[PDB]
mmCIF file of C-alpha atoms and ligand atoms in Angstrom:
data_model
loop_
_atom_site.group_PDB
_atom_site.id
_atom_site.type_symbol
_atom_site.label_atom_id
_atom_site.label_comp_id
_atom_site.label_asym_id
_atom_site.label_seq_id
_atom_site.Cartn_x
_atom_site.Cartn_y
_atom_site.Cartn_z
ATOM 1 C CA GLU A 1 -6.486 -22.400 -13.038
ATOM 2 C CA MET A 2 -4.097 -22.612 -10.731
ATOM 3 C CA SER A 3 -1.151 -23.353 -12.315
ATOM 4 C CA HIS A 4 -1.598 -20.602 -14.388
ATOM 5 C CA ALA A 5 -2.896 -18.479 -11.659
ATOM 6 C CA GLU A 6 0.701 -19.634 -9.963
ATOM 7 C CA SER A 7 2.620 -19.226 -12.569
ATOM 8 C CA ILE A 8 1.512 -15.463 -13.106
ATOM 9 C CA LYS A 9 1.943 -14.915 -9.023
ATOM 10 C CA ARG A 10 5.261 -16.205 -9.917
ATOM 11 C CA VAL A 11 6.546 -13.939 -12.392
ATOM 12 C CA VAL A 12 5.614 -10.781 -10.130
ATOM 13 C CA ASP A 13 7.275 -12.258 -6.855
ATOM 14 C CA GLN A 14 10.933 -12.855 -9.684
ATOM 15 C CA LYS A 15 10.007 -9.874 -10.440
ATOM 16 C CA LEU A 16 9.286 -7.191 -8.156
ATOM 17 C CA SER A 17 10.966 -9.581 -4.552
ATOM 18 C CA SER A 18 10.365 -9.838 -1.158
ATOM 19 C CA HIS A 19 13.899 -8.726 -0.435
ATOM 20 C CA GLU A 20 13.593 -5.187 -2.658
ATOM 21 C CA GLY A 21 10.239 -4.716 0.049
ATOM 22 C CA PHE A 22 6.803 -6.449 -2.115
ATOM 23 C CA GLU A 23 4.400 -8.719 -1.714
ATOM 24 C CA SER A 24 1.654 -10.273 -3.654
ATOM 25 C CA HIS A 25 -1.325 -11.823 -2.630
ATOM 26 C CA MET A 26 -4.345 -13.124 -3.897
ATOM 27 C CA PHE A 27 -8.708 -13.077 -4.359
ATOM 28 C CA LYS A 28 -10.855 -13.010 -6.014
ATOM 29 C CA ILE A 29 -12.523 -10.769 -7.196
ATOM 30 C CA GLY A 30 -16.103 -12.161 -5.932
ATOM 31 C CA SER A 31 -14.821 -12.124 -2.936
ATOM 32 C CA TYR A 32 -13.966 -8.251 -2.457
ATOM 33 C CA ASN A 33 -17.194 -7.756 -4.816
ATOM 34 C CA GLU A 34 -18.807 -9.115 -1.731
ATOM 35 C CA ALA A 35 -17.880 -7.426 0.977
ATOM 36 C CA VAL A 36 -17.736 -3.536 -0.629
ATOM 37 C CA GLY A 37 -21.642 -4.923 -1.343
ATOM 38 C CA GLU A 38 -22.170 -5.888 -5.011
ATOM 39 C CA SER A 39 -24.626 -2.395 -5.625
ATOM 40 C CA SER A 40 -21.936 -0.184 -3.943
ATOM 41 C CA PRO A 41 -20.188 1.623 -6.363
ATOM 42 C CA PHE A 42 -16.905 0.671 -6.347
ATOM 43 C CA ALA A 43 -17.920 -3.448 -7.058
ATOM 44 C CA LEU A 44 -15.730 -4.276 -10.463
ATOM 45 C CA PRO A 45 -17.024 -5.405 -13.475
ATOM 46 C CA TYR A 46 -15.543 -9.090 -13.540
ATOM 47 C CA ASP A 47 -16.822 -12.298 -12.967
ATOM 48 C CA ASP A 48 -17.182 -13.556 -9.067
ATOM 49 C CA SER A 49 -13.905 -16.803 -10.263
ATOM 50 C CA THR A 50 -11.584 -13.670 -11.857
ATOM 51 C CA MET A 51 -7.806 -13.904 -10.604
ATOM 52 C CA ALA A 52 -6.434 -10.671 -8.945
ATOM 53 C CA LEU A 53 -3.044 -10.033 -6.882
ATOM 54 C CA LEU A 54 -3.173 -7.184 -4.468
ATOM 55 C CA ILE A 55 0.940 -6.036 -4.706
ATOM 56 C CA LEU A 56 1.989 -4.309 -1.080
ATOM 57 C CA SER A 57 4.945 -2.719 -0.012
ATOM 58 C CA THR A 58 6.949 -3.276 3.210
ATOM 59 C CA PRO A 59 9.724 -1.606 4.128
ATOM 60 C CA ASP A 60 12.915 -2.457 2.705
ATOM 61 C CA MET A 61 10.676 -1.031 -0.524
ATOM 62 C CA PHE A 62 12.149 3.067 0.164
ATOM 63 C CA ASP A 63 14.464 1.721 2.073
ATOM 64 C CA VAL A 64 16.086 -0.682 -0.335
ATOM 65 C CA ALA A 65 15.171 -0.867 -3.494
ATOM 66 C CA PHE A 66 13.820 3.565 -3.552
ATOM 67 C CA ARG A 67 17.274 4.562 -2.360
ATOM 68 C CA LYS A 68 18.737 2.036 -4.870
ATOM 69 C CA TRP A 69 16.336 4.486 -7.905
ATOM 70 C CA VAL A 70 17.559 7.609 -6.342
ATOM 71 C CA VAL A 71 20.901 7.083 -5.930
ATOM 72 C CA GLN A 72 20.597 5.982 -9.564
ATOM 73 C CA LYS A 73 18.930 9.057 -10.992
ATOM 74 C CA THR A 74 21.144 11.598 -9.332
ATOM 75 C CA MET A 75 24.036 10.402 -11.359
ATOM 76 C CA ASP A 76 21.745 10.166 -14.577
ATOM 77 C CA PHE A 77 20.457 13.518 -13.694
ATOM 78 C CA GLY A 78 24.000 14.427 -13.013
ATOM 79 C CA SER A 79 23.760 16.163 -8.813
ATOM 80 C CA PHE A 80 21.078 15.689 -6.060
ATOM 81 C CA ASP A 81 19.197 19.405 -7.040
ATOM 82 C CA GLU A 82 18.252 17.660 -10.744
ATOM 83 C CA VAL A 83 16.749 15.062 -10.033
ATOM 84 C CA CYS A 84 14.792 17.118 -6.899
ATOM 85 C CA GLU A 85 13.828 19.757 -9.945
ATOM 86 C CA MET A 86 13.225 16.844 -12.607
ATOM 87 C CA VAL A 87 11.418 14.263 -10.214
ATOM 88 C CA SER A 88 8.336 15.910 -8.527
ATOM 89 C CA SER A 89 6.767 12.557 -8.361
ATOM 90 C CA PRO A 90 9.679 9.881 -7.061
ATOM 91 C CA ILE A 91 8.231 7.343 -4.582
ATOM 92 C CA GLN A 92 5.529 7.359 -8.479
ATOM 93 C CA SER A 93 8.269 7.215 -10.701
ATOM 94 C CA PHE A 94 9.916 4.630 -8.511
ATOM 95 C CA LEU A 95 6.652 2.291 -8.706
ATOM 96 C CA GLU A 96 6.167 2.887 -13.130
ATOM 97 C CA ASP A 97 9.228 2.467 -13.367
ATOM 98 C CA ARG A 98 9.520 -1.099 -10.819
ATOM 99 C CA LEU A 99 5.619 -1.788 -12.501
ATOM 100 C CA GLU A 100 6.797 -1.585 -16.107
ATOM 101 C CA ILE A 101 9.837 -4.870 -15.715
ATOM 102 C CA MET A 102 7.566 -6.621 -13.936
ATOM 103 C CA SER A 103 5.107 -5.643 -16.710
ATOM 104 C CA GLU A 104 7.072 -6.789 -19.101
ATOM 105 C CA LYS A 105 7.697 -10.496 -18.039
ATOM 106 C CA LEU A 106 3.691 -10.349 -16.942
ATOM 107 C CA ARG A 107 2.985 -10.037 -21.038
ATOM 108 C CA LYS A 108 4.148 -13.178 -22.178
ATOM 109 C CA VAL A 109 3.054 -15.714 -19.045
ATOM 110 C CA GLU A 110 -0.259 -13.658 -19.283
ATOM 111 C CA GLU A 111 -1.118 -11.255 -22.298
ATOM 112 C CA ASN A 112 -4.764 -9.470 -20.504
ATOM 113 C CA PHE A 113 -3.814 -7.792 -17.019
ATOM 114 C CA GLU A 114 -5.731 -4.154 -15.683
ATOM 115 C CA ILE A 115 -3.428 -3.114 -12.668
ATOM 116 C CA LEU A 116 -5.399 -0.346 -10.190
ATOM 117 C CA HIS A 117 -3.123 1.952 -8.001
ATOM 118 C CA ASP A 118 -3.871 2.882 -4.087
ATOM 119 C CA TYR A 119 -4.126 6.514 -5.791
ATOM 120 C CA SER A 120 -6.243 5.256 -8.749
ATOM 121 C CA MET A 121 -8.905 7.982 -9.281
ATOM 122 C CA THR A 122 -12.017 8.649 -10.976
ATOM 123 C CA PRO A 123 -12.557 11.490 -12.632
ATOM 124 C CA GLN A 124 -15.271 12.118 -9.547
ATOM 125 C CA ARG A 125 -11.657 11.518 -7.300
ATOM 126 C CA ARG A 126 -13.739 7.235 -6.570
ATOM 127 C CA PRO A 127 -10.645 5.761 -5.395
ATOM 128 C CA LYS A 128 -10.840 2.548 -7.843
ATOM 129 C CA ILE A 129 -10.222 0.304 -5.644
ATOM 130 C CA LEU A 130 -10.133 -0.088 -1.896
ATOM 131 C CA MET A 131 -6.974 -1.447 -0.788
ATOM 132 C CA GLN A 132 -8.307 -2.218 3.287
ATOM 133 C CA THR A 133 -10.434 -4.453 2.180
ATOM 134 C CA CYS A 134 -9.021 -6.028 -0.632
ATOM 135 C CA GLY A 135 -5.604 -6.485 2.332
ATOM 136 C CA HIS A 136 -8.783 -8.041 4.296
ATOM 137 C CA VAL A 137 -10.321 -10.161 1.757
ATOM 138 C CA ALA A 138 -6.476 -11.188 0.787
ATOM 139 C CA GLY A 139 -6.007 -12.378 4.747
ATOM 140 C CA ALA A 140 -3.267 -10.169 4.859
ATOM 141 C CA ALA A 141 -3.626 -7.151 6.811
ATOM 142 C CA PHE A 142 -6.768 -6.730 8.940
ATOM 143 C CA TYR A 143 -8.737 -4.041 8.948
ATOM 144 C CA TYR A 144 -9.922 -2.070 12.043
ATOM 145 C CA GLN A 145 -12.883 -0.334 10.458
ATOM 146 C CA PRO A 146 -14.546 2.254 13.427
ATOM 147 C CA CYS A 147 -18.343 0.991 11.685
ATOM 148 C CA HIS A 148 -17.287 -1.974 13.347
ATOM 149 C CA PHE A 149 -15.792 -0.597 16.606
ATOM 150 C CA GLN A 150 -18.911 1.133 18.219
ATOM 151 C CA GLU A 151 -20.582 0.789 21.235
ATOM 152 C CA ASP A 152 -25.149 1.300 22.624
ATOM 153 C CA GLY A 153 -24.730 5.046 23.590
ATOM 154 C CA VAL A 154 -21.209 5.927 22.759
ATOM 155 C CA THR A 155 -20.771 8.510 20.588
ATOM 156 C CA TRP A 156 -17.296 7.740 18.127
ATOM 157 C CA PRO A 157 -15.529 8.512 16.901
ATOM 158 C CA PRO A 158 -15.725 12.491 18.508
ATOM 159 C CA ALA A 159 -16.605 13.843 15.065
ATOM 160 C CA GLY A 160 -15.463 17.232 13.812
ATOM 161 C CA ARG A 161 -12.253 17.025 14.630
ATOM 162 C CA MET A 162 -10.430 16.612 11.685
ATOM 163 C CA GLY A 163 -9.629 19.471 9.246
ATOM 164 C CA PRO A 164 -12.425 19.451 5.695
ATOM 165 C CA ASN A 165 -12.809 16.455 3.496
ATOM 166 C CA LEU A 166 -10.872 14.399 6.302
ATOM 167 C CA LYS A 167 -13.136 11.042 7.349
ATOM 168 C CA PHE A 168 -12.094 9.340 10.379
ATOM 169 C CA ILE A 169 -10.829 6.388 8.214
ATOM 170 C CA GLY A 170 -10.079 2.799 9.033
ATOM 171 C CA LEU A 171 -6.298 0.720 9.450
ATOM 172 C CA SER A 172 -5.180 -2.089 7.869
ATOM 173 C CA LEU A 173 -2.651 -4.819 10.403
ATOM 174 C CA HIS A 174 0.645 -6.475 8.776
ATOM 175 C CA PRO A 175 0.790 -9.333 10.836
ATOM 176 C CA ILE A 176 5.168 -9.205 9.998
ATOM 177 C CA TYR A 177 4.389 -5.410 10.081
ATOM 178 C CA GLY A 178 1.992 -4.108 11.615
ATOM 179 C CA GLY A 179 1.250 -0.438 10.060
ATOM 180 C CA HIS A 180 4.680 -0.395 8.951
ATOM 181 C CA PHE A 181 3.878 -1.706 4.821
ATOM 182 C CA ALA A 182 1.850 0.169 2.326
ATOM 183 C CA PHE A 183 -0.912 -1.233 0.164
ATOM 184 C CA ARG A 184 0.276 -0.551 -3.721
ATOM 185 C CA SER A 185 -1.301 -1.849 -6.823
ATOM 186 C CA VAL A 186 -4.162 -4.953 -7.274
ATOM 187 C CA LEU A 187 -3.883 -6.919 -10.539
ATOM 188 C CA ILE A 188 -6.463 -8.198 -12.064
ATOM 189 C CA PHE A 189 -6.741 -10.780 -14.510
ATOM 190 C CA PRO A 190 -9.855 -10.643 -16.591
ATOM 191 C CA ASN A 191 -9.603 -14.103 -18.239
ATOM 192 C CA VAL A 192 -8.156 -16.258 -15.087
ATOM 193 C CA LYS A 193 -10.778 -17.660 -12.723
ATOM 194 C CA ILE A 194 -9.943 -19.766 -9.646
ATOM 195 C CA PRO A 195 -13.094 -20.550 -8.691
ATOM 196 C CA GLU A 196 -11.656 -23.157 -6.096
ATOM 197 C CA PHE A 197 -9.012 -20.662 -5.247
ATOM 198 C CA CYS A 198 -9.749 -19.533 -0.796
ATOM 199 C CA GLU A 199 -8.291 -16.513 0.388
ATOM 200 C CA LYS A 200 -6.900 -16.852 3.835
ATOM 201 C CA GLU A 201 -8.305 -15.318 6.002
ATOM 202 C CA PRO A 202 -6.570 -11.738 7.564
ATOM 203 C CA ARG A 203 -4.547 -12.692 11.537
ATOM 204 C CA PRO A 204 -6.351 -10.295 14.628
ATOM 205 C CA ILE A 205 -3.762 -8.549 15.104
ATOM 206 C CA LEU A 206 -5.540 -6.417 18.137
ATOM 207 C CA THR A 207 -7.484 -8.625 19.826
ATOM 208 C CA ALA A 208 -9.277 -5.121 22.625
ATOM 209 C CA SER A 209 -11.984 -3.226 21.373
ATOM 210 C CA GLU A 210 -9.649 -0.266 23.511
ATOM 211 C CA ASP A 211 -6.408 -1.270 22.361
ATOM 212 C CA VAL A 212 -8.192 -1.022 17.568
ATOM 213 C CA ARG A 213 -9.502 2.862 18.904
ATOM 214 C CA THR A 214 -6.644 3.827 20.232
ATOM 215 C CA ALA A 215 -5.116 3.206 17.325
ATOM 216 C CA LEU A 216 -7.832 4.332 14.943
ATOM 217 C CA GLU A 217 -7.259 8.001 16.647
ATOM 218 C CA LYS A 218 -3.125 7.334 16.155
ATOM 219 C CA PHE A 219 -3.417 7.247 12.431
ATOM 220 C CA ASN A 220 -6.696 10.029 11.783
ATOM 221 C CA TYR A 221 -4.957 12.400 14.688
ATOM 222 C CA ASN A 222 -1.593 11.550 14.867
ATOM 223 C CA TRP A 223 0.328 9.615 12.005
ATOM 224 C CA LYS A 224 2.759 12.180 11.191
ATOM 225 C CA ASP A 225 4.299 10.598 14.314
ATOM 226 C CA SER A 226 3.716 7.085 12.988
ATOM 227 C CA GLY A 227 2.749 5.777 16.698
ATOM 228 C CA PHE A 228 0.130 3.608 15.352
ATOM 229 C CA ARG A 229 2.147 2.387 13.713
ATOM 230 C CA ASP A 230 3.805 -0.174 15.804
ATOM 231 C CA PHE A 231 0.417 -1.627 17.174
ATOM 232 C CA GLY A 232 0.422 -5.098 17.495
ATOM 233 C CA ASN A 233 4.288 -4.347 18.334
ATOM 234 C CA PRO A 234 6.493 -4.993 15.059
ATOM 235 C CA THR A 235 10.450 -5.598 15.519
ATOM 236 C CA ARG A 236 10.100 -5.184 11.228
ATOM 237 C CA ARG A 237 9.539 -1.276 10.943
ATOM 238 C CA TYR A 238 10.122 0.950 8.707
ATOM 239 C CA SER A 239 13.414 3.816 9.355
ATOM 240 C CA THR A 240 13.686 6.647 10.675
ATOM 241 C CA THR A 241 14.300 8.390 7.333
ATOM 242 C CA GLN A 242 10.892 6.657 6.559
ATOM 243 C CA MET A 243 9.143 7.629 9.177
ATOM 244 C CA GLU A 244 10.513 11.257 8.521
ATOM 245 C CA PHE A 245 9.781 11.049 4.658
ATOM 246 C CA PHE A 246 6.567 10.790 4.376
ATOM 247 C CA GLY A 247 5.477 12.303 7.706
ATOM 248 C CA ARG A 248 5.729 15.412 5.963
ATOM 249 C CA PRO A 249 4.093 17.328 2.843
ATOM 250 C CA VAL A 250 5.497 15.699 0.066
ATOM 251 C CA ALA A 251 7.616 19.733 -1.248
ATOM 252 C CA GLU A 252 9.094 19.154 2.248
ATOM 253 C CA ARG A 253 10.548 15.610 1.550
ATOM 254 C CA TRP A 254 13.456 15.403 -1.495
ATOM 255 C CA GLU A 255 15.967 17.164 1.304
ATOM 256 C CA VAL A 256 15.026 13.976 4.089
ATOM 257 C CA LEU A 257 17.453 12.061 0.811
ATOM 258 C CA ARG A 258 20.148 14.071 0.504
ATOM 259 C CA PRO A 259 22.444 12.731 2.481
ATOM 260 C CA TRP A 260 21.690 8.953 0.410
ATOM 261 C CA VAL A 261 23.361 10.985 -2.871
ATOM 262 C CA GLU A 262 25.970 14.050 -1.250
ATOM 263 C CA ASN A 263 27.158 11.936 1.638
ATOM 264 C CA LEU A 264 30.706 10.353 1.205
ATOM 265 C CA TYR A 265 29.995 8.561 4.342
ATOM 266 C CA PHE A 266 27.806 8.086 7.249
ATOM 267 C CA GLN A 267 28.031 9.031 11.538
HETATM 268 C C1 COB B 301 -14.273 4.396 1.167
HETATM 269 C C2 COB B 301 -14.058 4.392 2.410
HETATM 270 C C3 COB B 301 -12.756 5.182 2.962
HETATM 271 N N1 COB B 301 -11.799 4.974 2.744
HETATM 272 C C4 COB B 301 -11.121 5.888 1.063
HETATM 273 O O1 COB B 301 -11.368 6.426 1.210
HETATM 274 C C5 COB B 301 -9.502 5.458 1.366
HETATM 275 C C6 COB B 301 -9.189 5.735 0.172
HETATM 276 C C7 COB B 301 -7.595 6.531 -0.827
HETATM 277 C C8 COB B 301 -7.193 6.369 -0.959
HETATM 278 C C9 COB B 301 -6.711 5.298 0.670
HETATM 279 C C10 COB B 301 -6.269 4.052 -1.174
HETATM 280 C C11 COB B 301 -7.094 2.792 -0.830
HETATM 281 N N2 COB B 301 -7.811 3.364 -2.618
HETATM 282 O O2 COB B 301 -8.071 2.275 -0.426
HETATM 283 C C12 COB B 301 -5.418 5.577 1.609
HETATM 284 N N3 COB B 301 -5.616 6.799 1.137
HETATM 285 CO CO1 COB B 301 -4.823 7.762 3.128
HETATM 286 C C13 COB B 301 -3.444 7.887 1.332
HETATM 287 N N4 COB B 301 -5.957 9.196 2.357
HETATM 288 C C14 COB B 301 -6.782 9.640 1.197
HETATM 289 C C15 COB B 301 -6.670 11.244 2.052
HETATM 290 C C16 COB B 301 -7.864 11.105 3.296
HETATM 291 C C17 COB B 301 -7.740 10.233 4.569
HETATM 292 C C18 COB B 301 -9.094 10.955 5.166
HETATM 293 N N5 COB B 301 -8.945 11.045 6.425
HETATM 294 O O3 COB B 301 -10.379 11.056 4.560
HETATM 295 C C19 COB B 301 -5.283 11.946 1.767
HETATM 296 C C20 COB B 301 -5.258 12.135 0.823
HETATM 297 C C21 COB B 301 -5.424 12.753 2.886
HETATM 298 C C22 COB B 301 -4.565 10.814 2.814
HETATM 299 C C23 COB B 301 -4.195 11.028 3.135
HETATM 300 C C24 COB B 301 -3.159 9.736 3.921
HETATM 301 N N6 COB B 301 -3.289 8.295 3.852
HETATM 302 C C25 COB B 301 -2.397 7.781 4.683
HETATM 303 C C26 COB B 301 -2.742 6.290 5.096
HETATM 304 C C27 COB B 301 -0.820 5.673 5.013
HETATM 305 C C28 COB B 301 -3.075 5.247 4.199
HETATM 306 N N7 COB B 301 -4.236 6.476 3.389
HETATM 307 C C29 COB B 301 -4.870 5.009 2.751
HETATM 308 C C30 COB B 301 -5.559 4.555 3.041
HETATM 309 C C31 COB B 301 -4.547 4.209 2.808
HETATM 310 C C32 COB B 301 -4.936 1.776 2.365
HETATM 311 C C33 COB B 301 -3.418 3.650 1.463
HETATM 312 C C34 COB B 301 -1.769 2.491 1.439
HETATM 313 N N8 COB B 301 -1.397 3.471 0.491
HETATM 314 O O4 COB B 301 -1.970 1.884 1.990
HETATM 315 C C35 COB B 301 -3.141 4.122 3.547
HETATM 316 C C36 COB B 301 -3.315 3.260 4.824
HETATM 317 C C37 COB B 301 -2.743 2.105 5.238
HETATM 318 C C38 COB B 301 -3.192 1.123 6.611
HETATM 319 N N9 COB B 301 -2.514 0.673 7.273
HETATM 320 O O5 COB B 301 -5.210 0.680 6.800
HETATM 321 C C39 COB B 301 -1.770 8.954 4.957
HETATM 322 C C40 COB B 301 -1.265 8.163 6.463
HETATM 323 C C41 COB B 301 -0.601 8.907 4.185
HETATM 324 C C42 COB B 301 0.612 9.658 4.831
HETATM 325 N N10 COB B 301 2.000 9.331 4.887
HETATM 326 O O6 COB B 301 -0.098 11.160 4.253
HETATM 327 C C43 COB B 301 -2.001 9.673 5.000
HETATM 328 C C44 COB B 301 -3.148 9.702 6.515
HETATM 329 C C45 COB B 301 -4.065 9.879 7.094
HETATM 330 C C46 COB B 301 -5.444 9.633 7.753
HETATM 331 N N11 COB B 301 -6.068 9.048 8.743
HETATM 332 O O7 COB B 301 -6.474 10.729 7.577
HETATM 333 C C47 COB B 301 -7.389 8.834 1.346
HETATM 334 C C48 COB B 301 -8.376 8.933 0.339
HETATM 335 C C49 COB B 301 -7.451 7.392 0.766
HETATM 336 O O8 COB B 301 -13.605 3.078 2.871
HETATM 337 P P1 COB B 301 -14.045 2.376 3.782
HETATM 338 O O9 COB B 301 -13.290 0.854 3.706
HETATM 339 O O10 COB B 301 -14.393 3.187 5.187
HETATM 340 O O11 COB B 301 -15.947 1.114 3.144
HETATM 341 C C50 COB B 301 -15.772 0.535 2.884
HETATM 342 C C51 COB B 301 -17.626 -0.224 1.953
HETATM 343 C C52 COB B 301 -17.459 0.408 0.142
HETATM 344 O O12 COB B 301 -18.649 0.778 -0.238
HETATM 345 O O13 COB B 301 -17.284 -1.078 1.936
HETATM 346 C C53 COB B 301 -16.193 -2.249 2.787
HETATM 347 N N12 COB B 301 -17.532 -2.445 3.989
HETATM 348 C C54 COB B 301 -17.908 -3.187 3.690
HETATM 349 N N13 COB B 301 -18.060 -4.144 4.996
HETATM 350 C C55 COB B 301 -16.880 -4.767 4.941
HETATM 351 C C56 COB B 301 -16.613 -3.911 4.454
HETATM 352 C C57 COB B 301 -15.034 -4.351 4.290
HETATM 353 C C58 COB B 301 -14.415 -5.834 4.826
HETATM 354 C C59 COB B 301 -13.527 -6.463 4.752
HETATM 355 C C60 COB B 301 -15.262 -6.764 5.500
HETATM 356 C C61 COB B 301 -15.335 -7.339 6.119
HETATM 357 C C62 COB B 301 -16.708 -6.425 5.528
HETATM 358 C C63 COB B 301 -16.114 -0.941 3.729
HETATM 359 O O14 COB B 301 -16.847 -0.487 4.942
#
């Protein structure tokens, strides 16, 4: 019931705070299953009224919280070069650490929960949960899907513009952050039912279909330049450092962080 659901969300929001770059949004599993299709491979095996929380990161996750974590790890390992050698997966390591701290408190409020990440997969490499769909049904961010922007006798999107095993995918836009955010995790509480809860509708960000199609092209074809993130004209944005980091392949990223821990000062 709903006081308990609110107490659960409160612990999450205490330990994964807005200031450090997290948000949470409540939704019902039934809303997700209705959207993906009740018989789709993505349908989740919980009753319709089961409580879930979507956790997303905002610009300060990287710029503030992760920066603090990298500074500390550098101190712990003794040098930046040592951290780089020993921590191949810094973003996921940071998130795992923060989620464990949260979970230690959350277990005392509701002991039974499952956690699915944006990167979680089955052994067949199917994503376990579709985050943009969660974001839309939870009202967190409007999900712009290519299949919703077709025109009769128009071939859009182009075919064969992207590399192997890549599809032309949709894009969610947040009402504060545009594309300067990411989905991170969903917590599912199988023993907590919230049938009376009504999710808010996601705010429309792009109202003209030609802007949507342009945004989707910028995302699929040009994402390294982060232009897609500025649709909706957000004022709260990823830093330059953060856009450089996520625009690079993982093997080239650590050097972007060197100044955080090796510079006496900045100028
Ligand atoms: C399965 C199908 C395709 N979608 C997917 O397969 C996406 C899954 C996944 C894991 C995302 C996380 C996740 N767990 O969701 C993530 N990627 Co990928 C890391 N990605 C990849 C994968 C392939 C990308 C590709 N182009 O094919 C890569 C690893 C290469 C990948 C790479 C990137 N990715 C990137 C990003 C940012 C994201 N990626 C996402 C999409 C996500 C959500 C991850 C995140 N964390 O937030 C990012 C986008 C956020 C946003 N603002 O929307 C990016 C830029 C990361 C980077 N900096 O390097 C980079 C390039 C993006 C690009 N456009 O190519 C993948 C696979 C994903 O979903 P679908 O929505 O089309 O179908 C679905 C269907 C299922 O039955 O029902 C639903 N439905 C039906 N009707 C209705 C609805 C739903 C609603 C709401 C309705 C109202 C009606 C809905 O239509």
